[PDB]
């Protein structure tokens, strides 16, 4: 219902994070960030309200109600997996007992299933972040109002690799640097194809359950061409499939972390009224409020058995 | 549990000579075999994995082939930096078992041992024990015989060096451990050393 | 061309099946950077 | 990767080894422990996959040894318990992705014999000797004139009713002795006893 705008946001956010610097690894969670600012979208007043929905690529043809309820069916569908893969999302809101409007409370309790001393608050927040993510995000405090969200992912490959064919092969970093990483090896039938619009190989490996990973191997020099012409319409076309060829797959194992504070990037996406003095947060409190930072952290793990990822957001 | 038979257990060779050792498994291992090398004073280093694919950084002298149950390691032109013990690894199935090991040693011309006998010092002798030591330094090959004559007639412990990294010779120490009364009773301690350089033993003796 | 090696920097998506929304997106340039 | 933590353990005791690592990720590689018996036979000890699952143990050590990872601190562990005389070996921590690289090892000695400093004796008659008799455990460091000559045979140690005994031989030109000092330096870290005994003519 809101997934086409959700992928466009994931790509708009991806471009600026990658355009900022292409010299390091990138890993973030679009759903966690989207829910964080969509949760705040219910407690914000005009001209900050609007910039928030527009910054999530939403106003034009959809009402504000149908947007918030898309996220309740979103988070309910994700928090209800047919458990072969482990997937859970959690929303937190750490108030400090002053003043609340209590209409913001009823809205976030319904739509998003949400649940001074610096040391006590810091330890309490990070335990809530480390509890749901199974200790993946452990070390992710300013003032009265804090909103936190977390996601946990743990799936297994439909056709797992064997841990004897994983040989250490070269990895081309920048046409001068070459590092050796443990690459997994497997032959057989794969859901692989060529775009002819992206100049890149597109490989889909489905996880056991309701999840699927897509891998884009760009041609020589076409890495930037891939990042610019990658849209929602093309991935849905790729997800309509079962044209499977056969090839030998060399997939490297992975373990990386994102750790982005992104107050600056969102301004480039239209959310400028985020930490502004003039920014209006009236649906939240009756005493008065503004944001100071927006930190996002996410970890990834790829092995022969499956994938284990977890992301968190702190506003 | 796959038993890894590795042949031969020990063999000599010269510089630039072709050396080939074999490793046979108790069952088929789908060519999942790795070859190691161990220097005497250092840890094993990986040379080949998958039985035909070299580890990055290993000289092109090492070859290797084999399929199913019989695998081989070949050195086209042997060097002095390749002398040591070679191990063959099995990682087709758990548990991962290795081979017995092949000792590769350097070869050279035959030599005679420098024999030296040592009476027990009076610092040890005033403790209830006495040890007569007989050194056999810088000989070749390994096989050498030692006879301990005490009064014209025959507790001996021996020790062997590995192989000298300079002249490729061996060295053995022979210690006859006696008591204070047993030592102080007899007089004519002799240490024969029988090698194949000649049919006459090389004798060292003393009188207290 | 059955020789697909991922030895170059690449981009990956991690999308849910039933919802069709991307849960994770990233770009791998060096696996050693952990 | 450099491992440490070895030492002497009484029979039935317990010990935990550690393998700290830097220079690679260590959160992307599979880790394992491999030991080298005094009979120079290598045999696989443990295998933990990457992340923590799943650990593998041969039946000889299953139920007694426990391998574990700490990817946050980049440290591999090996909890040993119910040690026997067969467990005495040099243990190695190994990272393997097809190719594997081993550390320099750490020595475990499982015996009920009590720690004992060596008794150093001069072996005078030109080949000079230095008898290191009755120490436990291994090793000892024998140098001639503080390693100045170092050109010298050090023989492997013999076990004589639960003590080690070895000899060290040095060959000098006939002009040097006793026209130049010859002292055999014997160090034993298990007892922290550095002993230097000169060699006298008679
Ligand atoms: Na590297
Ligand atoms: Na190498």
Describe it.
The complex is a heterotetramer of chains A (315), B (208), C (34) and D (202). With 315 residues, chain A is an alpha+beta fold. Chain A is 30% helix and 29% strand. Chain A has 9 helices and 12 strands. Chain A is globular, with a radius of gyration of 21 Å. Chain B folds into 2 domains: 1-108, no CATH class; 109-208, Immunoglobulin-like. Chain B contains 2 helices and 17 strands. In chain B, a hairpin with a 3-residue loop joins strand 5 (44-49) and strand 6. In chain C, strands 2-3 form a two-stranded antiparallel ribbon. The termini of chain C are far apart. Chain D is elongated. Chain D is mainly beta. Chain D has 2 domains: 1-112, no CATH class; 113-200, Immunoglobulins (Immunoglobulin-like, Sandwich), CATH 2.60.40.10. In chain D, the strands form 4 sheets. In chain D, strands 2, 4, 5, 8, 9 and 10 form a 6-stranded mixed sheet that branches. In chain D, strands 11, 12, 14, 15 and 16 form a 5-stranded antiparallel sheet that branches. The chains are: A alpha+beta (315), B mainly beta (208), C mainly beta (34), D mainly beta (202). Chains in contact: A-B, A-C, A-D, B-D, C-D. Chains A and C meet through helix 1, strand 1, helix 4, strand 4 and strand 5 of A and strand 1, strand 2 and strand 3 of C. Strand 7 (211-218) of chain A pairs antiparallel with strand 2 (10-16) of chain C. The structure holds sodium ion (2 copies). Chain A: Glycans are attached at residues 22, 210. Chain A: It comes from Homo sapiens. Chain A: Keywords: Acute phase, Blood coagulation, Endoplasmic reticulum, Extracellular matrix, Glycoprotein, Hemostasis, Phosphoprotein, Protease inhibitor, Secreted, Serine protease inhibitor, Signal. Chain A: Belongs to the serpin family. Chain A: One of its GO terms (cellular component) is endoplasmic reticulum lumen.
What's a concise summary of this model?
Chain A: It is found in: Secreted; Endoplasmic reticulum. The complex is a heterotetramer of chains A (315), B (208), C (34) and D (202). Chain B is mostly beta strands and 208 residues long.
CATH class of chain C: Mainly Beta
| Assembly state of the chains shown | heterotetramer
Q: What is the global morphology of chain D?
A: elongated
CATH topology of chain C: Serpins fold
N to C succession of SSEs of chain C:
EEE
Give the domain tally of chain D: 2
Query: What is the CA-based Rg of chain C, rounded?
Result: 13 Å
Number of helices of chain D: 0
PDB class: protein binding
Keywords: Antibody fragment, Antitrypsin binding, Diagnostic, protein binding, selective, wild-type, Glu342, E342
Assembly: tetrameric
Entry title: Fab fragment of an antibody selective for wild-type alpha-1-antitrypsin in complex with its antigen
